[PDB]
Specification:
part of a larger assembly; immune system/viral protein; 2 chains; Spike protein S1 (chain A); 0% helix; mainly beta
Chain lengths: 49, 49
């Protein structure tokens, strides 16, 4: 009841009560990463995934 | 000269693989500041190498 926001083990904001009402949760981390390109070979074809 | 045998079974543990870690420097470096990327791109391929 006295805790508004809460961090994680990595010291990052994870969730916080809605400051207005409804006493609900909050954001979650978005999607990211390293996009890779798969090519069977330019000598054979030109496909890409 | 020995007269009797003793069949024994020993164990041996050897690692062959480790944790396949992948750290994205887009989120580690310049977490959420949009102006931080302008200075991060000034360095070069430190996020690629």
């Amino acid at each position: 009841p006295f805790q508004q926001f809460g961090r994680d083990v990595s010291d990052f904001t994870d969730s916080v009560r809605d400051p207005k009402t409804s006493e609900i949760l909050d954001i979650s981390p978005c999607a990211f990463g390293g996009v890779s390109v798969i090519t069977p070979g330019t000598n054979a074809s030109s496909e890409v995934a | 000269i020995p007269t009797n045998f003793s069949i024994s079974i020993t164990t041996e543990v050897m690692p062959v693989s480790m944790a396949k870690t992948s750290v994205d420097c887009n989120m580690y470096i310049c977490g959420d500041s949009t102006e931080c990327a302008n200075l991060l791109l000034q360095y070069g391929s430190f996020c690629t190498q």
